Amino acid sequence: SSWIPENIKKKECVYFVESSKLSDAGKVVCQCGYTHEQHLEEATKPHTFQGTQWDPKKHVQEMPTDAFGDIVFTGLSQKVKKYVRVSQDTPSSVIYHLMTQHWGLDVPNLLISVTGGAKNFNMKPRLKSIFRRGLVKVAQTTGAWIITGGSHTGVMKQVGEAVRDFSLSSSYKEGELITIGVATWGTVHRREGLIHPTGSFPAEYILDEDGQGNLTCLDSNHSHFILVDDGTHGQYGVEIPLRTRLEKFISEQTKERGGVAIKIPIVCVVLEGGPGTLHTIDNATTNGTPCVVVEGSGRVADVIAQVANLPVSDITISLIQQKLSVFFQEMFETFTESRIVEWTKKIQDIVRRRQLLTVFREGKDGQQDVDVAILQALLKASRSQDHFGHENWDHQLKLAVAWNRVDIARSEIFMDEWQWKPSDLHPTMTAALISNKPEFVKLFLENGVQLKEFVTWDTLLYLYENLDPSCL
Amino acid sequence: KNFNMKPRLKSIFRRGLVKVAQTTGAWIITGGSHTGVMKQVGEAVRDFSLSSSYKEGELITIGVATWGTVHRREGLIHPTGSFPAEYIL
Amino acid sequence: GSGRVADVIAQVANLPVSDITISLIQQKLSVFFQEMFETFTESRIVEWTKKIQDIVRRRQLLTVFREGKDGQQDVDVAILQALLKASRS
Amino acid sequence: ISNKVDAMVDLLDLDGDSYHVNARHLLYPNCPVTRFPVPNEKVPWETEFLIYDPPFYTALEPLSTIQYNVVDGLRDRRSFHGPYTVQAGLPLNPMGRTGLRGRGSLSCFGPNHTLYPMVTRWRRNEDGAICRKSIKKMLEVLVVKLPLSEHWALPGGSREPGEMLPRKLKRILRQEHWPSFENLLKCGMEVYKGYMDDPRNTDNAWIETVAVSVHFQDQNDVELNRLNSNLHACDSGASIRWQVVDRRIPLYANHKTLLQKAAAEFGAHY
Amino acid sequence: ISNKVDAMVDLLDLDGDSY
Numbered sequence: 050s051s052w053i054p055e056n057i058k059k060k061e062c063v064y065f066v067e068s069s070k071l072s073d074a075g076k077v078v079c080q081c082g083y084t085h086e087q088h089l090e091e092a093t094k095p096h097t098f099q100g101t102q103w104d105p106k107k108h109v110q111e112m113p114t115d116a117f118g119d120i121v122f123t124g125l126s127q128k129v130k131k132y133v134r135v136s137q138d139t140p141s142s143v144i145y146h147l148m149t150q151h152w153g154l155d156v157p158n159l160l161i162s163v164t165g166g167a168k169n170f171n172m173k174p175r176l177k178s179i180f181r182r183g184l185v186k187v188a189q190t191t192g193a194w195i196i197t198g199g200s201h202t203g204v205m206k207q208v209g210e211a212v213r214d215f216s217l218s219s220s221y222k223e224g225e226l227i228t229i230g231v232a233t234w235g236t237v238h239r240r241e242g243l244i245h246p247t248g249s250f251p252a253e254y255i256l257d258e259d260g261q262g263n264l265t266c267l268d269s270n271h272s273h274f275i276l277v278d279d280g281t282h283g284q285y286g287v288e289i290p291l292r293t294r295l296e297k298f299i300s301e302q303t304k305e306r307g308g309v310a311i312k313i314p315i316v317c318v319v320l321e322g323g324p325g326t327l328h329t330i331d332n333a334t335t336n337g338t339p340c341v342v343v344e345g346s347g348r349v350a351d352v353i354a355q356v357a358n359l360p361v362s363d364i365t366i367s368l369i370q371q372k373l374s375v376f377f378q379e380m381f382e383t384f385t386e387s388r389i390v391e392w393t394k395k396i397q398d399i400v401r402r403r404q405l406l407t408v409f410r411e412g413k414d415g416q417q418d419v420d421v422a423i424l425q426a427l428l429k430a431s432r433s434q435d436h437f438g439h440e441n442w443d444h445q446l447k448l449a450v451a452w453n454r455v456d457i458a459r460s461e462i463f464m465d466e467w468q469w470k471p472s473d474l475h476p477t478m479t480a481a482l483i484s485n486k487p488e489f490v491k492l493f494l495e496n497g498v499q500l501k502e503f504v505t506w507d508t509l510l511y512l513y514e515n516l517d518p519s520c521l
Numbered sequence: 522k523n524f525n526m527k528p529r530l531k532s533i534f535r536r537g538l539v540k541v542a543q544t545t546g547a548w549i550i551t552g553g554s555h556t557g558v559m560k561q562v563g564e565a566v567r568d569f570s571l572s573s574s575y576k577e578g579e580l581i582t583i584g585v586a587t588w589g590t591v592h593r594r595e596g597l598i599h600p601t602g603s604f605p606a607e608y609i610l
Numbered sequence: 611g612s613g614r615v616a617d618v619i620a621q622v623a624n625l626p627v628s629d630i631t632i633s634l635i636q637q638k639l640s641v642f643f644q645e646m647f648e649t650f651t652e653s654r655i656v657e658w659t660k661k662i663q664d665i666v667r668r669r670q671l672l673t674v675f676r677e678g679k680d681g682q683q684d685v686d687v688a689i690l691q692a693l694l695k696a697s698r699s
Numbered sequence: 700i701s702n703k704v705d706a707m708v709d710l711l712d713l714d715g716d717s718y719h720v721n722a723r724h725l726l727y728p729n730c731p732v733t734r735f736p737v738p739n740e741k742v743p744w745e746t747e748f749l750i751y752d753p754p755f756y757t758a759l760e761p762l763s764t765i766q767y768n769v770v771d772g773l774r775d776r777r778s779f780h781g782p783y784t785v786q787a788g789l790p791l792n793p794m795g796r797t798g799l800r801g802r803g804s805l806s807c808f809g810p811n812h813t814l815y816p817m818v819t820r821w822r823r824n825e826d827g828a829i830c831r832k833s834i835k836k837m838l839e840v841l842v843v844k845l846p847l848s849e850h851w852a853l854p855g856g857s858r859e860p861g862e863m864l865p866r867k868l869k870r871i872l873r874q875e876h877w878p879s880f881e882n883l884l885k886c887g888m889e890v891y892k893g894y895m896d897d898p899r900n901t902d903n904a905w906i907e908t909v910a911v912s913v914h915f916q917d918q919n920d921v922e923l924n925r926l927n928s929n930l931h932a933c934d935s936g937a938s939i940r941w942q943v944v945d946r947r948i949p950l951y952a953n954h955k956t957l958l959q960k961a962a963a964e965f966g967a968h969y
Numbered sequence: 970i971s972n973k974v975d976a977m978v979d980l981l982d983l984d985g986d987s988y
């Protein structure tokens with residue numbers, strides 16, 4: 050409570066230009082997004098003549114944050130949920146510093162990310178079933194961290210409703226999942242009351258979806274909340290670069306096993322979407338994240354599906370208009386000619402990096418939950434990639450034994466070689482025994498790891514430490 | 522002394538050895554040394570011979586080696602004959 | 611599948627002797643002559659083509675036993691196939 | 700039966716511009732600017748750029764007393780790709796632009812030269828045995844890292860006039876061996892001379908490269924490798940490590956395409 | 970088995986004045 054407003058800062062607009070904009074339903078706006086009545090404390094008055102035209106970055110300076118605490122809702126959920134306010138230029142290093150010992154969160158083991166459409170979405174049954182089943186299967190095992198925005202809209206709300214569908218019946222009870230929400234301070238309905246000078250921490254946020262009007266209310270659905278600010282009011286799509294940078298930083302350098310480096314497997318999955326989803330995928334691909342698209346979601350899945358493995362050159366603008374009439378139907382009105390043509394750069398950028406994008410067939414390929422697609426993406430972008438080393442190999446298998454995919458284990462053997470010594474498979478078979486899947490230990494015995502030197506005194510003590518609580 | 526082991530090759534070699542040696546009067550010809558599969562042919566020989574109805578030696582395994590390539594030659598030479606022929610391994 | 615000698619003979623047994631060149635020997639010198647490359651010299655590498663050619667051109671006295679796809683059993687099938695090929699035919 | 704019918708099903712079911720994009724790098728590094736979309740059908744100059752509003756970031760037209768694309772002294776002021784073209788008053792960089800004009804926050808005017816050296820030392824275990832590659836001889840190429848950087852950088856850069864040493868080879872490296880390697884560094888065949896796909900180029904200037912490929916028959920080949928290493932002492936770098944730079948080296952994305960063509964320097968299989 | 974053989978049968982069977 051004494052480390053923040055000291056190491057985490059905020060960015061605001063230091064003067065007003067009152068450009069002639071009505072902000073739809075409203076009474077005049079600067080361009081800052083706020084009004085003259087509430088535009089900081091001295092920023093309402095003009096600071097001499099800095100400039101007669103608005104461009105944010107040249108004049109803005111830094112002031113500390115004022116939004117921190119833990120949100121407790123009236124009746125929706127009687128539990129503690131932490132939230133922090135972050136700036137746009139804040140490095141991810143200090144943010145990870147905040148997560149580990151300032152919030153009491155352990156090191157991640159999986160960093161699946163979910164992005165999708167907000168207030169432009171539609172529902173069908175078996176897609177919902179697939180999404181929910183994949184969510185609980187990936188989140189209940191290991192220490193997977195699911196990263197998603199902040200809002201209660203569509204599949205974005207359904208990820209959380211699946212979270213509590215699993216959490217209502219849980220042996221450990223309380224919170225077995227760490228779901229982090231990311232949103233922009235500008236796009237928050239009930240900001241009044243979320244600001245405190247030093248700290249009070251009731252952080253009351255009633256979910257009043259009726260009075261939101263134009264800014265979607267924050268969900269009651271994410272365990273941790275990240276609320277970014279850039280100086281913009283009601284502008285979505287601002288946190289796209291920062292989210293990608295943060296997830297990357299928490300991807301490669303949070304563990305030091307082996308004495309050099311450990312790269313935690315990471316996948317971002319997209320369902321439906323629009324321009325903001327396109328920007329998210331583009332920034333994610335530029336940073337170096339494997340991405341998977343679930344086909345059939347609508348209006349975004351097919352376009353990426355039928356350009357993923359196709360050559361980049363033949364993808365023309367004309368092809369974009371032929372793809373603009375079937376899966377850009379309801380969003381054609383908001384798309385203008387100067388705005389339509391931005392859909393070819395980002396798609397080309399994502400496609401030409403074929404090592405970080407895969408398509409998940411809904412009907413004919415991988416007819417199962419999202420585990421097969423996610424692990425295929427991880428093995429394609431982890432083992433076959435020219436950048437990653439040999440240390441993380443031991444971690445793809447530890448991830449795979451949880452997903453009980455032994456055909457993939459057979460497949461991955463043929464291209465890697467553990468010529469040094471087979472003894473590196475003892476730690477993974479320790480976890481295989483607790484996961485209890487016998488095909489993996491059968492593979493281990495047929496590979497030739499001898500059980501004579503495996504079970505040691507400390508090894509058997511650790512195995513006896515992890516009996517199944519269900520049995521007597 | 523230049524060899525490596527893997528399980529199912531060992532199983533195939535051993536199974537073939539006992540099946541071919543236990544039936545008929547097959548003579549298995551092999552060198553003299555305890556190294557690798559060269560040692561494993563013999564270890565299969567005693568793996569079969571330890572449990573045998575006729576007992577004693579049901580197999581005739583001949584070893585061929587060069588006198589030059591013998592470690593403990595001292596004591597293997599006799600003028601006419603004493604025949605304890607002690608050779609500690 | 612045994613290693614460093616089995617594949618080389620396997621993929622030259624039924625192949626024509628003429629196309630087996632010295633260059634083919636060096637392409638076979640990098641994958642199954644890895645640990646023995648140090649002891650093999652240029653004057654000693656080239657002796658690996660005469661003996662292989664001599665064994666191969668007598669196709670009636672050499673056979674290859676597939677570990678996985680042909681004769682998936684103990685060595686009896688391969689041995690009897692060799693005996694019938696070199697005995698009756 | 701149930702799984703053999705499955706194994707039976709599978710097999711009887713069977714029985715436009717691709718040009719440089721890295722130059723037009725979105726999210727230009729070291730600058731807070733975003734680009735308008737310039738598709739792959741919009742890479743050539745002849746196509747009409749409907750939304751052409753390029754950035755004007757320069758942290759100026761310093762064209763006075765400096766003849767661009769001309770023969771001005773021993774400055775390498777000529778573009779090797781034939782005559783240049785001008786678009787109204789502002790000339791266009793051949794191949795493509797990247798998003799910076801003039802000189803920018805760089806060292807000085809002229810070209811942002813590059814001069815990549817390389818050193819080889821035999822692998823000592825007990826007498827100097829060689830660990831080959833899977834197929835052919837993979838000679839131990841080696842690179843170094845900049846003292847404060849996230850990437851490995853060879854001791855090269857913009858060639859200072861009259862010196863030919865880009866301030867990084869003569870310093871923070873070996874001592875008392877400077878004159879020896881300078882003669883060798885100007886004796887070799889190039890890997891590529893021309894504009895190259897990097898997100899750190901300029902519209903008014905570009906990179907002219909000089910490269911030399913040299914192999915030492917012994918790790919003690921005079922003072923080039925043995926005495927140079929014996930007289931080299933940094934004593935300031937926080938981290939140091941030595942590895943053979945195979946496909947595992949995280950160099951520039953610029954350098955991978957250069958290496959794809961420079962693999963022919965030795966003819967070995969990478 | 971009974972319906973997969975049926976699904977198997979189908980595809981290998983294959984694999985003047987107009988005024």
Ligand SMILES: Nc1ncnc2c1ncn2[C@H]1C[C@H](O)[C@@H](COP(=O)(O)OP(=O)(O)O)O1
Pocket residue numbers: 804805806807810811812856857897899900
């Ligand atoms: N390949 C490259 N081309 C141009 N600038 C590069 C570059 N790689 C890195 N830079 C940038 C990062 C440094 O902060 C900056 C320093 O530039 P400088 O040394 O002042 O001039 P110059 O780029 O001519 O050498 O160069």
Ligand SMILES: [Zn+2]
Pocket residue numbers: 062064065066067078079080081082083084088
């Ligand atoms: Zn304002």
